[PDB]
């Protein structure tokens, strides 16, 4: 025969949990110590409490393994099976209503993001050139997000940063076809540029600055939309040159939803 402490150790369980089981009545030692008063159980009563807790594992609260008690179903294979089974079929349902609301909830974010784009005002400003040290890259990439990856832990080495809370998303086009990015910093002249690294001049631009206000990946929906329509819908035409996103204090990660990042768009 088995002690209480010995029944709850090999089930992992508190000793309680079995003398509760005992004043409802559904799981009862087959005798009470005579000098005692402790409670001992039979082997023979192992799966008996074993098929208890696995109910109890699925969350079936307890008053529902009392009621299969009393009617006899706990003690039957048959009737324990079907119980299980109804229970299944309840398992399955929540999680196909679920998964129907993340469809739903789906096809709602992406109404959300026409939305965006059709709040995505844009605001004329001239800047004069300045120049531009970091990372840069020669080459029609299909990686980016990469480059800044590559570019972040490096960054300290940047000597003379004329603003260090705001960086530079830097794409310039070449008349080869191919485009040019560089990610980095503006920096005063005559600063030393650090090891694989280089110093871009951003010429003196007129400049349409759409306010992107989501995640980094989403930037080139921006960049479709703008250049879909948006810059003519404003009677903007868009002019050779050199772009770039404005990374300051509004951005919080390439994967934050809370974001902004302003893209400043070369016009005529
Ligand atoms: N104090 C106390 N302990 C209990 C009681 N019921 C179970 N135990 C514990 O359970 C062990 C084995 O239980 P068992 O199957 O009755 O197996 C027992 C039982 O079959 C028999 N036995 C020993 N003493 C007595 C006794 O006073 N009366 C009876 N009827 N049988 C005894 O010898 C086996 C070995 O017993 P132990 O080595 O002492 O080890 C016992 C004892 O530590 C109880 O009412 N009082
Ligand atoms: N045919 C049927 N009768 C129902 C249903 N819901 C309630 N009842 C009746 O109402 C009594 C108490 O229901 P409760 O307050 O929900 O209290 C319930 C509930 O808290 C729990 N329970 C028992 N069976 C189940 C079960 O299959 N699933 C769940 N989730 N809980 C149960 O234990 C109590 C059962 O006590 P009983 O003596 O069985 O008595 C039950 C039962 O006769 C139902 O969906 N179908």
């Not at 179903?73 to 099976?81: F, I, S, W, Y």
Request: hydrophobic fraction near 35%.
């Amino acid at each position: 025969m088995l002690t209480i402490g010995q029944l709850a150790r090999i089930f992992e369980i508190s000793t309680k949990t079995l003398r509760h089981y005992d004043a409802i009545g559904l799981f009862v030692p087959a005798r009470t110590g005579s000098d005692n008063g402790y409670r001992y159980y039979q082997p023979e009563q192992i799966e008996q409490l074993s098929r208890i807790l696995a109910l109890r594992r699925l969350d079936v609260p307890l008053e529902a393994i009392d009621r299969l008690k009393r009617d006899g179903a706990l003690d039957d294979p048959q009737r324990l099976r079907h119980f299980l089974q109804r229970h299944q079929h309840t398992l399955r349902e929540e999680i196909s209503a679920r998964q129907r609301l993340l469809a739903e909830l789906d096809r709602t974010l992406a109404t959300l993001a026409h939305w965006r784009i059709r709040n995505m005002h844009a605001r004329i400003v001239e800047r004069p050139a300045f120049s531009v040290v970091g990372m840069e890259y020669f080459g029609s990439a299909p990686t980016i997000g990469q480059l800044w990856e590559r570019f972040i832990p490096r960054e300290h080495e940047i000597a003379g940063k004329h603003d260090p809370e705001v960086s530079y998303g830097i794409c310039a086009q070449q008349p080869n076809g191919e485009f040019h990015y560089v990610a980095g910093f503006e920096v005063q002249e005559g600063w030393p540029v650090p090891e694989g690294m280089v110093r871009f001049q951003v010429p003196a631009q007129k400049y349409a600055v759409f306010t992107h206000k989501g995640t980094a990946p989403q930037i080139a929906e921006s960049f479709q939309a703008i250049y879909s329509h948006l810059l003519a819908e404003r009677g903007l035409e868009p002019k050779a040159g050199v772009d770039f996103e404005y990374y300051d204090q509004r951005f919080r990660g390439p994967l934050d939803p809370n974001s902004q990042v302003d893209l400043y768009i070369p016009i005529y």
